[PDB]
Amino acid sequence: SLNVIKMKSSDFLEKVSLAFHRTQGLMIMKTVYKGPNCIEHNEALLEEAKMMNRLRHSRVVKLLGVIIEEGKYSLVMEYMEKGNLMHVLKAEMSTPLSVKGRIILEIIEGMAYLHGKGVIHKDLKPENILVDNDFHIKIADLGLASFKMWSKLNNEEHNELGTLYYMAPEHLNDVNAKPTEKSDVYSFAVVLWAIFANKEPYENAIAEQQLIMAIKSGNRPDVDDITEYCPREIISLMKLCWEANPEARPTFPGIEEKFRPFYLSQLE
Amino acid sequence: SLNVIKMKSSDFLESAEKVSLAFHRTQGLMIMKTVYKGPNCIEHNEALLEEAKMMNRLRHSRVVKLLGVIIEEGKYSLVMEYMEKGNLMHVLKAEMSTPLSVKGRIILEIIEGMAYLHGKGVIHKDLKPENILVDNDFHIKIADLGLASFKMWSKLNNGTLYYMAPEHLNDVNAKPTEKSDVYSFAVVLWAIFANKEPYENAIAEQQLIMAIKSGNRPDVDDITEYCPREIISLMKLCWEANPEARPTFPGIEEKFRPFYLSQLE
Ligand SMILES: CC(C)(C)C(=O)N1C[C@@H]2C[C@H]1c1ccccc1O2
Numbered sequence: 001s002l003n004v005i006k007m008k009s010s011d012f013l014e015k016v017s018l019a020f021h022r023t024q025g026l027m028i029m030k031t032v033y034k035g036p037n038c039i040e041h042n043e044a045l046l047e048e049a050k051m052m053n054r055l056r057h058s059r060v061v062k063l064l065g066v067i068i069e070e071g072k073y074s075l076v077m078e079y080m081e082k083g084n085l086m087h088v089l090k091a092e093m094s095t096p097l098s099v100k101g102r103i104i105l106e107i108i109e110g111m112a113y114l115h116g117k118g119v120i121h122k123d124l125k126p127e128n129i130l131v132d133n134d135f136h137i138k139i140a141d142l143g144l145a146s147f148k149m150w151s152k153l154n155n156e157e158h159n160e161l162g163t164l165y166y167m168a169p170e171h172l173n174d175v176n177a178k179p180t181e182k183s184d185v186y187s188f189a190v191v192l193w194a195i196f197a198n199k200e201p202y203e204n205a206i207a208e209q210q211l212i213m214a215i216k217s218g219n220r221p222d223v224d225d226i227t228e229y230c231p232r233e234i235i236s237l238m239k240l241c242w243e244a245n246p247e248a249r250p251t252f253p254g255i256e257e258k259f260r261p262f263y264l265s266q267l268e
Numbered sequence: 269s270l271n272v273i274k275m276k277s278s279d280f281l282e283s284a285e286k287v288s289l290a291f292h293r294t295q296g297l298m299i300m301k302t303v304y305k306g307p308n309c310i311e312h313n314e315a316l317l318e319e320a321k322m323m324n325r326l327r328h329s330r331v332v333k334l335l336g337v338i339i340e341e342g343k344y345s346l347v348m349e350y351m352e353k354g355n356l357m358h359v360l361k362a363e364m365s366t367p368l369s370v371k372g373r374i375i376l377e378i379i380e381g382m383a384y385l386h387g388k389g390v391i392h393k394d395l396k397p398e399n400i401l402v403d404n405d406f407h408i409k410i411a412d413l414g415l416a417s418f419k420m421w422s423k424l425n426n427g428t429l430y431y432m433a434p435e436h437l438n439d440v441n442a443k444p445t446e447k448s449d450v451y452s453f454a455v456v457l458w459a460i461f462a463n464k465e466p467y468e469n470a471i472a473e474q475q476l477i478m479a480i481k482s483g484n485r486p487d488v489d490d491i492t493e494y495c496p497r498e499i500i501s502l503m504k505l506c507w508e509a510n511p512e513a514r515p516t517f518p519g520i521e522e523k524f525r526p527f528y529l530s531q532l533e
């Protein structure tokens with residue numbers, strides 16, 4: 001029941017790709033490695049897929065299974081029709097405030113679950129917030145930031161196969177700094193901004209070193225760039241969550257206790 | 269935040285009605301369940317505080333939050349959040365009939381809440397409509413008002429068998445499981461659509477007890493309003509005699525959530 005479903009390539013009728021399972025239906029296959037086989041790390045890879053399978057929550061992307069074969073390594077996850085959050089925000093159909101409120105709440109719920117399971121995301125951004133046809137979201141880890149062996153497998157010498165806007169300032173120009181829960185909270189602040197801006201931040205930045213050094217100095221996404229009606233409470237929340245000092249930023253349970261009654265009274 | 273807030277009676281401005289409504293000076297409207305009042309007796313306080321610490325761990329939108337605890341000379345109280353519309357049965361028996369879309373959401377919220385508690389190693393043991401509180405916007409939270417999970421407060425404090433699984437009827441020594449709560453959820457499912465307590469409110473006599481043990485269940489034909497086929501199958505599945513036949517709440521949620529979205533809302 002709770003075990004990892006080991007899948008085979010032969011289960012699929014027919015590198016992130018859409019894939020149809022013979023009984024079970026339409027799925028998404030992220031093929032991590034294709035090349036010469038090495039069975040030495042298969043035990044560790046499978047154990048990481050077991051860890052992936054344990055993280056079950058309505059706002060977290062479920063691993064439906066894993067293909068571990070001679071030379072091919074793939075993760076199989078559920079289909080999300082509308083794609084990532086930024087694709088939805090940049091679309092010609094404008095997403096209403098009530099849905100945006102629910103999205104934010106769902107992101108908080110999902111991040112609160114993961115932190116409760118001892119999982120720091122390290123790489124929360126609109127690209128990792130997938131959206132289904134009914135505008136409900138699920139948090140993903142598409143670049144395998146939380147999963148060392150699959151991440152090493154992806155960047156392997158024989159394998160025949162990022163955005164700094166949401167990264168907390170403590171991690172900009174500092175590879176040694178160990179990510180915390182508050183690292184993801186910073187990212188959530190900029191995602192909050194993006195949701196109401198309907199765009200990526202820092203458009204007026206001319207160079208990368210300019211931007212990096214500006215963010216480290218205290219510079220943040222422009223609140224005056226928000227053309228839509230964003231509430232005062234949400235502007236306070238993002239301002240709180242993007243504080244320079246990580247101790248000043250709240251926890252996701254902290255965010256949820258404030259935001260949920262606001263969503264109920266105002267947004268829905 | 270994160271630790272049990274030891275509160276004082278002096279933090280409350282008044283306490284209008286032992287469950288009573290109470291206003292905190294800095295934190296607004298709350299509910300005070302005063303468990304014991306009278307002569308003070310230490311040698312439970314260490315254990316009582318530790319149990320209140322266990323209560324404090326359980327944070328979830330569909331679970332009643334313990335906002336704090338009063339442990340004073342003679343007075344012992346649990347302080348929890350206010351749910352305006354009262355328990356689920358009060359809402360179901362009200363003159364305004366609750367629509368199917370809200371009932372679907374209630375069921376989903378009950379599942380979410382129960383799934384959280386099982387995930388935290390907490391068997392309820394006493395799930396029923398009296399322990400399902402309802403806010404002004406018809407969202408629910410699961411409660412443990414009889415203190416079934418908290419032995420010392422329950423002993424400090426000191427009868428519906430309609431939601432109790434047959435394995436517990438006439439076997440008080442039997443250790444509860446997750447499937448015990450799933451049985452209870454089945455009868456709650458029945459109650460939600462029946463709009464009443466099951467078995468014609470008959471006294472929980474040996475005839476009834478032994479009938480339930482033998483296979484007897486709440487009458488599905490007593491549901492006069494429209495209940496979907498899926499929900500009738502679910503309650504029938506969840507009240508199976510054999511606990512191994514009954515699903516898990518995660519099992520229920522995986523099937524029920526898409527059903528709620530397509531059909532019920
Ligand atoms: C399959 C894939 C790696 C893409 C994923 O997104 N997840 C697997 C589990 C659950 C979900 C997930 C999200 C975020 C962090 C870890 C994590 O781990």
Ligand SMILES: CC(C)(C)C(=O)N1C[C@@H]2C[C@H]1c1ccccc1O2
Pocket residue numbers: 322323324326331332333334346348385390392410411412413415417
């Ligand atoms: C305060 C009171 C005892 C009435 C309660 O309902 N709960 C405290 C925690 C959270 C919530 C709760 C619900 C169900 C089981 C345990 C439990 O424990």
